[model samples]
Target: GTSQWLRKTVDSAAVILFSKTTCPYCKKVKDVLAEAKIKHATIELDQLSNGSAIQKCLASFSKIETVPQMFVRGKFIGDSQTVLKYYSNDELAGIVNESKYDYDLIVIGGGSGGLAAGKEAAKYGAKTAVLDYVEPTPIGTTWGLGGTCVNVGCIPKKLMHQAGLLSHALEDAEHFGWSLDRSKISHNWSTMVEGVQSHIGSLNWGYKVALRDNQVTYLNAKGRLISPHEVQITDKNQKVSTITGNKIILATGERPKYPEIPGAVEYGITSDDLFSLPYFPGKTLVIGASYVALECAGFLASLGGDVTVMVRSILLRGFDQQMAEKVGDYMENHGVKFAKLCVPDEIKQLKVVDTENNKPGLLLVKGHYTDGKKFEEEFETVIFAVGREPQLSKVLCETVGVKLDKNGRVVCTDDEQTTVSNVYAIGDINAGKPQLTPVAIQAGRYLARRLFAGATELTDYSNVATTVFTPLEYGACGLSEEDAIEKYGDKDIEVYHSNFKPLEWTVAHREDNVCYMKLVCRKSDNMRVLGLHVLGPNAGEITQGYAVAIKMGATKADFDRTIGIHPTCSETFTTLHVTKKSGVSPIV
Candidate 1:
């Protein structure tokens, strides 16, 4: 009588999970719940009558009919997936904590990667907390906590780039049966910029809702590592509060670097300032050779700025050589001037040029080459696009035992683990190559699997690749031909490559359209693929898939055996032929 009463009480209890040993899916669900430590009464309904008995049994307390029905305070919750969701959100935590152990995972900096890592750790049954200083408001740039990617980094920049691209597209609308006067094709800076800002606001709101829905504890404060497992969070009022985590993930993104020229700090503005400028400046001088520098310069130039670029070194240094040259040629031909190999000496903010315009003009003096003469010019704006540094200072690495390299990046192992045993770092903070957003996302996902799930393997990085977001997409993976030669002797490998204009650019009357690629392989081994690199229109998109192939140990012959998708730029990968006399034979 007591057993039946206990069974009845359990059946009519808050949640009931029906499972069968024979069903693999059911076993999977059970295991996930168990690993998550979710406590729900399990009934073997396989041998029971038509499953209606379970439904009737549940209906005694609440009206629900399902195989895996859940009730919370006599209310019907959905099936297994819903249960898993509830478990992840800690909705089941009150009952779950009544039995199993508790956990706390604090993720600092609510950037793209940090948000993902926090959500994933929560899903894996940790009581997750995310601390960000950004006011979850109408997405202010670098002013709020969603990290750089949301506020000022990828999202905002990409939106602006797309706007520029769209305006450019409209200028060429004659051929597409959409006749428009080229003279009337003008871009309104204020309207387009506002659109981008508004979109960012919507995304920020959505991100906040997601964190809230998932039951992640959100804190609006500047967090510094007070100790290994603890963070001293200072709120807006500068009141300090301490929070502890069993494990921590540092994802404090990066900020644009501004050069220190004489009077530069007083007058110079980095990319971060460009997003929220009150009005556009004319006669802009953009310094540095990075893709960001080039893109911002091009955008400003397109929007009627007398744009000039000063390169400290070769533009796009990390990019493919030929492709960089081609892009440089194109930019130069299209009114973007370059003062090659010049370093700025000073940037002094002069009086406002006309009180009505309210735009501050700058006096830029630079050291010119050949004669070592001083060159001077007056410009409406000076932008420093030299580089960016990861925001590791806020993280206070010394307290957490998280080591940083000379550049102040989190020193991480191959597996993304930092100096601390259980703690990990990813994205720009973790000193990984190619500090791209996607790379960080992948690293976070992989780290989540290894830390939470029973995955024992490390992330393979053989062909992890990325692309620069310039007008002509430049994508690359594996070792470059030059790197290959330096690693192995030049004579030890033969390089196979192709250079041609893409079909689309040719048809669209786009000049200087080029695609160049190289594959490096051992000469003795007859061109067994060691590395593959490409720079072209779809360089990023094309190289990503090949990166997977290369990581999986693909050879030249393996590439040849695969069918090419004709008329596509990516087909260049498989279509190249190698001669045996040149020590480039198929490696079948």
Candidate 2:
């Protein structure tokens, strides 16, 4: 009976240092949250009417026998050392105050990964909730609460890629069945942006309602671990609250990183701003060699912008080099200009004396090549697609003792648990794992099932499939040719490749660049598929099925035995007979 009121009163305050005033350590734990400036309630368990009784359960709950036990934000956390070592590796964030845990699992992010695990936790009767908050960009870009994939990453990324494809589709219209003049067609950025934002708003509201119906509390607040079972939530208005959970799952994703270069911040925008830019991005100069830079440049070019990509290094660094090169070939040929080996010096805005269009001022970008050759250009817009940094670091990593790698990603074990046993992470924020929507989403579900549903399997990365949203899309899975060759040696690997013509391309007479496919195979066995790479329209679609072939250890003979889909670009694989080993060019 006292345990009822014990939890009731303890869970009602910011902090209640339930220590006996007579004890020497009593004053110390009181001053723990005190000097820290967090709201705290102090209590002398030795003097209350039911002092010894409440102290009896707290001692039983924590086995501390009436010392300075912490009643932090309604959850009784650790004793002295939770804050004493306040800054030590052994005594940070989630100190084992969870002697009386509050929740089954609390997902600290509402991204694709976090939402999947949060809902999955409750689907199997787990008491759970998800906490998420979107901190606005430097130039004030914020959005609905479904994490980056729904708001800025996958959903809007794919939609823009699809819009780019529509531009290509119109290019083919003249030869296919069209009666219209090509010059009459126009693309509207505001209209496309409205559709994108409208759909995202629908998804966010749907997710908002879905959480309520599913009986999971959705806290639209930023969560930082105060202890192993406890978290501090700061809402948008700066109101802070705290709660405890039995287990924690961190699926916080990343935010686009802006270069620390001067003027870049004031003059530059990112993918975070591009999707919903009220006006068209004109004469855009995209800086970076990342897929984000390429994708944004491609889509913007397709929509008829004067697009240019400034690369500090080779394009698509981790992808198949040959395939990466060919994608750039298609892009450069399609009017996506490339400034190879040049890094940005600075950016400046031209004075907008005439605001007839109400658009931002033209950006004057100054850059120097690798060899110190200087260059400058005036562009209507400048986008920095350099990279992204993990959002977990912005949360409390050091405070919670959640170990982070050099890049601020949570260093995790095989099961996604960090140095802290009760604390776990999944998907994007977890270090040394593939960062993709599907990868994170599945990791969330798998991690949930492992904790609650007795599932034994870990998320697989060996044959994880991925696609780059390039002008000519690039998709691949399994080891790249570089990996295959390095692992198996050049003499033991067999390469089968061909630049197959797409029938649809033939119809459009729009075959300026080739659609390519290649299989990296091992010659030691029956020519087993080591990897599959595709560069074509819907390359993502092609790799989806072909990835299965690579996963199942399908050999060249296996692909040859399969009945071919007639006249399609994918059919090239089923009929593939040419070999790079043969020394005969596949050039048609």
Candidate 3:
């Protein structure tokens, strides 16, 4: 009797389930569909007086008379056990999402986050595309794919930092009984630039190949959200096109922010231009006290250039102040001059009097101090490391009605979703998240899983480990001492610190107190580690292992129980016993 109604229901709905009320198998199938948030029409045959007749009709149509008969898009999907099999084999998500849109996901920005998200979404059998474009720097420095980290940020910075350290190593080599001519050891700016650029060029090609291998459509174009489910893409030649998706992600990262001073844009260069400067950066003056500023100054000074760091305020703001001061002090000892409490008011390019040589003139930077004092200094190159801001304003976020914060960053929920239901934001474009490459990659991967694979897990942004690559590297994970004190109160926290000289540093007779370790712990929580900070050689390498331990709820007692590796800088954490309250010198 209900045969015609059953055929119409199956044909009309994208997903249809025929079941008997109060059947456990039917409930299981219903719960699975509901968990995926999939829309479906379920018919409970047992509730009707002609339920037995309806069961007979379902058997005739589907060749099965089971209580939990399921059909996806007018085709039978078997029973609950078969559905579970499909889900286990990773076929259910794709089958459930078939023909939903032109693409299952479209990620805008082919940086670390967007590329990872695109690849991950494709792994779930979802059609995915990634759009990326680089806006040229003020000095016409533009790069290929792989975003900031590979082009102008992490990769090139670290390589140049390594080059600077090699100069220091050459000096150390003399003490290690190696015969080397000090005058013969010199760094060629062009050679280092070529080496760094070559590595970066390969990485760009690798990313393109990876996207192709992952079946993700990679477009070298700028993408803007025109609607909740559609994006407008503009290519390099100013050609425009449109693409639609069921979901879209914004991972367009940030760029360096320059100060609003006279002649700043025309004369001063940011990190973007510094990595690939055609001419050698001679007599460099780096502005700002950010990690970028200090690191650039540290390397340039180490590389035999006269380098000065002009700090507007404190060093390495948002870091542990003790460690920040230690890094600054180490830099000062290693030939970096710090103009503390100084800000740049204007930058002017001086005229070159010697016209025959065809050499560029120096930059005259006017310094404004907090004490109402002004001074002027000259340097061949002036680099601004003030900060970076998100690139959201030009991406048409406001046009699509996605809300952004006052700082021009996209506001996101705990799950990284924006105000629009089908749109999300990740990486530096999102407000109130760490702007690290690894963090972006993890967030992007997790977002893809939740959107495509029905994963409910969210990214954990806490206890992220990071390093500042000054002449003496400083690395830390978890809350800073200031943040811990603000959150847990001074009485509720204990800080265990130690100052030691590394074994290698001992050979070089380096400063004893420069290499320091600090552990901030909560007094009430079984002395759980709230933070771990290290300042020494290979600080990033030392902090990485401890970051995992801290994330696993490691306690001070756990650290104490672990055996120390002899002649290693990381072992100092295991032996830290002097507390701040004890009023004893941590130097050993």
Candidate 4:
């Protein structure tokens, strides 16, 4: 009879607690449940007439004839010890409060990271919502819900880079036996911009459709964290509303930084406006040596624009310096000018004057080298790619008590948890993580699984392969040689390298030794690969497969044993034999 009664009670309530009225362990579990405000039915077996019989009934199911045996949604959850473990880890509160809020998870900033997190949370049966909004650029450029990667950053940038590649293809066509005249070919800026914008528009719409299909709410509004669990949303119409969630994820990515100088903001445009420029940016002067600066300058040059890149110091700051110099060399040979050690001091708008055929007026950009030598140039466009800063200021991070680093990026533990208990940060918003789209997307998905699906796997941010689409592409993964030497001493690491000509390049009489590959390995572990770097055509595609091998702990011997594909740039890695220690010539 007690077994029948216990079965009926467990089936009736979503949360069922079996207890003895006087047991301290039972009281501990009750206190936790009450503190989380969880609604549950507690059956005090001691108060019942056949209490001993009920103990035997619970022992058969839970395998423990103990007090404070809890069952959540018809599933047994051990005795009081289990409850305390869950409570200490915050899982008990997460589960208890899940049903009490409007959504199980509320993700702010629907970028690559936010979208992936929201969708993954929904997949784990958590009611999820995503809020995204784009603040207009000073030049009045704004976009849809897919965030920077889809709208202005990756997708459009790559497309424009492709347009630049086409120009090189046309030039190389003559060497490939094509009788086509190069004089008739010219790039149409408006046509290319329209094509890129159209593709981005489709991606924005697809992101919206994906959220709807996954049952995650998509709000086109700016979200500010008002509290640990509450968000204030302001729509385009200036209407404001508030929503609550059990957990919150901040994925609000960064925006490009503008230089502080006279007429810099008024005269300069960033990468955000470059992709969608209604008129051509003629005689552009790009400031900074970051990847963004090189990429835009490289493409603009290829598109027949008179582009000059002004670098304060180094090219591609955090990248391999050797490779960076080589990239600069190749771009320079390809007609892109580099003003090394130069900084923009001021930008002044000149009176509208068309130098070419009835185009926009040129602006005067004044700058000086670190040596104090000054120079000024007239250009139709002045683009700043100095760097990007986190968009945390407007997100109301202070109200929610989310800790930030000195650079204004959100501070988080390895688990992506912010200072606030129930709030987390991911993507470019988080300090010390790679500001990459794929990295953010993976981190977001992993965070959702840990929060909702009971997963324990953390995202591996190390050895992430990325490409720089310069006039000559440069791709790399893992540590740079300098980084390896600094971390493990130069004597402890071995560097294998080669400079081989690509087959396609040979036919066109391309410069030899321009395409280089290097592999950094540890000397102590039978030369376990530490880094992989490449500068050649399709470098991104070549480095990606090697990245997987390196991640799986592939060594120098492993690479040597792998068969090399003939007449390919990537095969050079498999055949690497010249070590930095040997002082042998790597050019082949």
Candidate 5:
């Protein structure tokens, strides 16, 4: 039993109950409070003359867009079922105590790494809080509460790109004499985008629900670190509020960079803005030589846009030279105009001199051509696909004595802890090679395990595999031949490569672009599969399997012993032959 409302007039000590007046469950809760003589305030929403005070309180406390939301001492508590569960477990009093402490762990950025850390921290009986700048991450680009994979980056982009690919494949149907109106072949871009938004919305809601169930608090605003253990959250109206926590995790991811060519900023957009656009450009010019640039160009061209790609140097810079050239060739052969070794001098949004199908277009200047030439061309859109940089300046770590790297990423030890004692950083913001969404997810989950269980094991990212989504999928892992030769004496290492038509292309009567696979091993032992590289269809899928096998200590003999999945493109790995006479035996 506790004090009645008449006995406790203090607002801070008041036990505020959220109930719908007509609900039997709520009525029962009121009876318990009344019989116990506990001091409480009930804001019932189902009453005839009532405006929901509890909902208004939740909005003021958490800035949550939806309701039946509950809070105590400024910490989110959740809905009816959640309160009921707390009461049943005899945990309501404990929750109230935690709410008084502000937070146990405060995670900034609601992206992939942050959400994973927030949920895991809350699961272990620690109060957690998550804050984001945006209300809902806009549609596509994995804008869900669960982070990049669920919202905007991979899942949504892959599905939409696949749609573009299928649309292209249908264009060739007329050769088979199945005549149909080409105009009838259409896709509802707005509907698909909205549907993706709906799916992501459900996921975002579910994340909030899960957090409520776990007793993790959340706020929708920009959370800036004011002190080592304190954060100031700025709401949409610029009203600043404060919260404190014992431990902090920084998982804020990267945003795309736009170059400063003469008029680039005035008339350009980064890959980030590609999603949620009211409409797409009819004639698009994509800049940069990286995989993102190529993928964007391929999709735009397939969708009937006049697509042109500009590469300042050899495509896929830092990739294996031969394989990179092959991918560039494949992209070029598929009707994408390749402006190799060219640089963008300026971008100009011209008056709508020409409108094709009512779509406005503009002109752009390209200098420093591959053949010592320069020219200008017209396009409707200019997309800068250059790169991304981490967003950690908002952390204000310098004020708190946390050191950052030269590139601005948070510097951390193998334990994932930053220079500051209990604070940690992960994903793209951590010191490491390769910035991919999956890599961040792995780092975040591993850090949680290590922190919670005192596990000393660190993630071995050696030979971590990656891929580029383009016409030809490319995958690679471990030291490249150049790096291997530099590390080990060139004469001591053996290298082998093969090229052939993938069986699918053979059956489809498409031009057979050579698929290449290479393996490097020590000349003396020839036992371990030192490195693996594949350039062909499903290369990403195939190389990931090999990465796991290699990590598990699978050797060359082990790879050979496993019977090949016959006629599959990946089976080529098991059937490869060594160019050298004796060191490694011929496969298959």
Candidate 6:
């Protein structure tokens, strides 16, 4: 009868902790749950008349005479020290929480990673649901189903970059025997945005159809952790719902950060809003010295806008400085203005009238240079292209005991498993992972294969290649030049670089703008290649093929042995021979 009552009581709630009020370990056990903020039914053995009998039965069942015992989702979870051990590694949260769930897996955030993970799990016949919602921007902008990449981030950014490239191509075409009249040709901000938004709309619809076709339920709602096994879903309105899952995944990604300056959020727009901006972003002030900042400024300048970039310090903080400065120089030579070393403190309206945007009013930007020299300017539009931070604050990770890094990203193991054992994170939200869309999708698929298909494949994150679409594109793989030297001192590292103009640019008589590339290699390991960087047309394409070589442990000798493709920018890597130590000019 005692055993029956115990079984029923344990089955009633997600978890039941059997304890004594006087026991020190019991208090610790309660403290752990309390800190995690999980709901648990506590049965104080000293308070009940049948407490002694229940304790005797618990000892018989669990074989532990410990004062504090935990039964999670109707399963025994051992005493204090054991519980604490699990808690530390986040195994305890997964153990003590959920049992019978509505779905086998529930992926929060229907982004690339979440969709990929949900689909893969469903392939193995696991019931899955993907929850995604677009949180409106500070300026009240929102989009449909697809996450940032499809809705705001990569898709629109690349489209706009392509528009800028096309305008440049038209100029090049003139040099190659086309385009009779320059004044007749024009670029329209409204039409370009319309086409970009149209393509994104189709992609958003495709995601929904794919989810349905794959039998993975897609819920259009915001997801927050309510328990280790449960998520509370809130839709656009006040409609609230809840779902339980045997496994939970977070792939909510990140949002652009706004500076803590006055009138910044109220007056400025981010890359997210700029893609579909109704009017011409005339006379733009692009704040922050990021790839996003330069890319936006570059496009705006190329597509007929007076653009100036506000830089606090150096150009790209983490990239190779030499290559970065070249990028900045190229942009400057090509006409995009730069506000060097300026810190934006306040952005006020110069004209308060609600004027239309093919004719928008001016914004007063006030700040000081890094040297404390006061700086002020006015622009028709302000775009904040600063860094991004994960949207984890409202995700309610504490409820599930999921740990977050100091930067607010989900703390996950190398295997993408979060502190809560059943919980996992991928994409921009996962700590230590690159904030790339492909990385997220690949990680999500790999995670699902391990969880459902019994595969042991782990996602490889090393030697990933990335590109920045500036006026002069930059693509890099492996370590940066600075990082390479830091890893193995300048004495042991060999830097090979060259300056050559692209053949395409040559036809346009753009001889002043020289493209550059570099290779950082280690002498100790048979001249092993450690870094590969390029700044020119098709840099993204060049970096991709070389990234594979870098990942496969290719040496500098290996690169030298490879035959060069004639009249191509990437051929510079294969032809690399002049070393920085030689003190010879790399000019070709």
Whole-model lDDT values for every prediction: 0.67, 0.81, 0.85, 0.85, 0.67, 0.84
Give the clash total for candidate 6: 0
What RMSD does model 1 have? 9.5
List clash counts for every candidate, in order. 2, 6, 0, 0, 9, 0
Per-prediction TM-score, please? 0.78, 0.82, 0.84, 0.84, 0.76, 0.82
Residue-level lDDT of model 2, residues 1-588, one tens digit each, is 667766644543323567787787767765654564433345666776777787788765567665787754345567777667753454433442233556667899898999998887766445678998888887788888788889998899899989988987887898888886767899888789999999999999999898888778999999998878888899988998888887799888888888888788887899998887777787899999888999999999998889999999898888888888998989999999999999998887784423466465687899999887996999988899998888665677476788999898999998889888878988788898999888888888888766654344788777898999988898998888999999999999999888777888887886733888888899998899999998888888888998777778899999989998886778888876778889977665
Off by over 4 Å in 1: 1-103, 134-141, 352-370, 397-399, 578-588
lDDT by residue (189-277, candidate 1, tens digit) is: 66776777787788778878888877778887777876767778898899987877666778777777766667665667777767756
- In terms of lDDT, the poorest run of 10 residues in model 2 is 90-99
lDDT of 5 by residue, 1-588 (tens): 112221121122224555575677667666654554433445455652433443444455546423344455435575656766877788776765554447757888787788887776654445678886643322233244665555656656666667667654565455445586555877655665676567778888988898777667878778877777888899878899999876678877777777877877667765665654445566788888887787777766666567889888778777777677877787788778988778888887685433344344576656578687876887777888887777678756468877888888888887678887657887778877467776666776666544442233576667788887776778887766666667777777777666757665653456654677877666656556677778787788888888888777666677778888977877777856675435554332
| Model 4: residues with Cα > 4 Å off, grouped in runs | 1-98, 351-359
- Top-scoring candidate (lDDT): 4
Candidate 4 to truth, TM: 0.84
How much is 199 displaced in model 3, in angstroms? Answer: 0.2
Q: Better model by lDDT, 1 or 6? A: 6
RMSD of each: 9.5, 13.0, 8.2, 9.6, 12.4, 12.9
| Model 5 misplaced regions, further than 4 Å | 1-101, 134-150, 168-199, 351-361, 370-372, 525-527, 580-588
